[model samples]
Target: SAYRHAVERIDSSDLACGVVLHSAPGYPAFPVRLATEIFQRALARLPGDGPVTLWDPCCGSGYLLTVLGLLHRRSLRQVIASDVDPAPLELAAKNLALLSPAGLTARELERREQSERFGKPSYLEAAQAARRLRERLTAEGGALPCAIRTADVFDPRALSAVLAGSAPDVVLTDLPYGERTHWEGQVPAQPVAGLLRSLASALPAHAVIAVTDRSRKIPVAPVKALERLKIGTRSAVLVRAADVLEAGP
Candidate 1:
């Protein structure tokens, strides 16, 4: 009943990638329902009552982070998104900006121009959706603060620099997989292991990290693996970065 009510309240069209948020080729969007569920699962494990900062290290197109930012606007203090490729960060920034009134207004104006110039009814619908989203955003709280940057998840220095000013309370990332999207740039042979190791050293002890991959069981050791989730072909692991000394024998 609760799930049904939530689904009913959220208009899927308002959150569609190309409709209200920017979308790009090769950067597949995460399903809204699955992203929400995974975010809720990770949030439940977090220890604080205060508003939290959320990060997506592998935030391709920032669809997942933007959606989560919209859905949990009041509950989030800040949103941080990063990807190895700079190309996607451009789209990611546009998507993340929709969390604010000004950003949505800009989108509405752009869509209106498209509707008038191209005579596409879909653009008109998108403009209306942006209005609705802006109203909902006002009701929730004004706007969520977001920071988008380019960072390699496996590079500790780069990742640390991106996270230097604000340490995220929760990190939720869907690892690149399949033929369409895979690891890029100087990635190690064991990408998952390398990512986990880098994340363990980079993140604070209090942060809870949820990583989803379509591969086998995730490796443990560098981080304290707390939970494992399997849904269809995908596998997810919830882990907390252990203290440097604790990571050793």
Candidate 2:
């Protein structure tokens, strides 16, 4: 019932983008509903001025970012997505392309579907919503600030490069929990904690991040814990970036 309620409130075009994003091939999928709510919670905590840039360092298939892009294209000043895997990184680019300023044609959609990449996006509602948005955006013809890149989350230089370019107001990521999938990387026992420590040098002091996982304890070491939320099986911690730098070596 709650899921239904959440679905009902989202814009039709946003739902369209989400449907197709959900149908993307390969890559581990995060539940769209969960991803949206988690990011929305983080967004609410952002300062109400300047560029509302959001970055997802561990972006997978760009589903979360694409959905948010469709929902907040006007509200967000820019969106940056990056991931270690080149394969999924490319896929992220493709998904984000649908929201391109130039917009896409119905014929183009058919061609992409027939190309055997994303497979058939069977949701009729989704297609109709896309058609409407395709017209709406093309009419307005305004470019959206969105970028997808390939980079390792564990690399400080890569993180610094991303931050230097956009300077996100908030970082929202859905870390891979050890369910059927996990991020490819070496670890220091507590992998998420280890990742944050490595990022301490690069992350903006005033920025905030929302990290979600299914782990028993999410170590919010460098990042001072502001709030902990339990959503069904997973838990999310919203932490202050400056606090993390202060607490770090």
Candidate 3:
């Protein structure tokens, strides 16, 4: 499902928590390490020599895409994942590092983009950098993943803007709902729509928004009323309002 060359797609692999399930109690996600499989598939179908991105808008634990980067061995050019929760972001960063058991540190892998060349010997510098990082973490254990950021998905304004940073080709997010999260006025409404609209502004034609809502109204747009579901359930939908445009599968 994470295969979106023509449109925003979800990652279809055995990486969603690593269990192959025909049906789960709730949602579906690919194995963490297989996150880049979707994009690789897209690359196979599309023309070459360009940049590509995979986004997890509601990256709570930072599990999916981070794992994708690790499994695919995509040097910095392959992936971009983000989350609202600080702990998961931290964990995601740390976890992504293990994939390079042979070399490099999480800090270096994370900062690879800031390097002069996208994928030069930055890995070597990363190795040199790891000595210091290892000393620090060894003396005193590492930080918490949830501590990576102060806010989660609630910060729509900032989140929306940062998304345009890499100009994503696809948007893959497991949107929030239910008891696990705090809601606006104890309700889960407008934020979903607002996110859709804001995302629509930046997303390319037919960009996808993968949302998972069990109870609260769906983020699905084209509402008869602002609160009404003009499309269907509150599960998920894709939109692209770039100019006078409309999207379809």
Candidate 4:
């Protein structure tokens, strides 16, 4: 059920949230409000103390991760994201760079692309939102620390290397859905489930892993859904990281 090479592919043209995937060129995304709620629910499920560490192995253009970072900057200790493509990771880097309390400047906005082939002022809209997020964080204190990189989600060694010493309290990822976007690894037979299972040793026992895909029924072994949601055709589920690894005899 989980597509191999599952990644964020939200198009850059859409700016439903004043920016959507505007931070970089990759793909469009699900509804922002819906995504926000989905993350909120997932975060609520993580029974833990202190600041949470968030990681997105399939982070693309860093749109979803950036937005969530803004929403939970104060509460989360750090945010980490990685992708298979260097291009998307570059965009993710730019977006993650905006979490600074200082944010982007008018000059920086002017220097950006500002317009796209679709004629949507996505760059400007996203820049505006970026500035707002920065300002809000500055007022609250400062944005959460973040790191962006390129890595294959299916590669446990790659993911583990990226994780370093930190064990993620919550892992949320949007699996690559479209036929053209699906990219897998050695275990293409079981992409998402396989990837998570491989990553179990690297993550904490109580970590909450939230996964979203186009299909509601992702045949992941030992999967346990703490919550499920559907936004249009996209389906999402939040489960324990251990459940994914512990599944099956």
The TM-score leader among the candidates is 1
Model 2 segments beyond 4 Å from truth? 1-18, 101-103, 106-108, 111-124, 135-141, 177-189
- Model 2, position 65, has a per-residue lDDT of 80
lDDT of 2 by residue, 33-68 (tens): 676776666766666555477888888878778776
Q: Write the per-residue lDDT of candidate 4 for residues 63-156, one digit (tens) a residue.
A: 7887777666666789989878786777677667766754455423642555543456655666665566557667755857888777777677
Q: All candidates' lDDT scores? A: 0.77, 0.64, 0.43, 0.66
Candidate scoring better on TM-score of 3 and 4: 4
In candidate 4, which residue ranges exceed 4 Å CA deviation?
1-25, 106-130, 178-189
TM-score for each candidate, following the candidate numbering: 0.85, 0.76, 0.46, 0.76
Candidate 4 has what TM-score? 0.76
lDDT over C-alpha atoms for residue 204 of model 3:
60
Residue 223, model 3, lDDT: 31
Look at candidate 2 and tell me the lDDT of residue 195: 68
Tens digit of per-residue lDDT, candidate 3, span 84-167: 556455545544444343223444445455455555564445544544434433343232111122334445566555554555
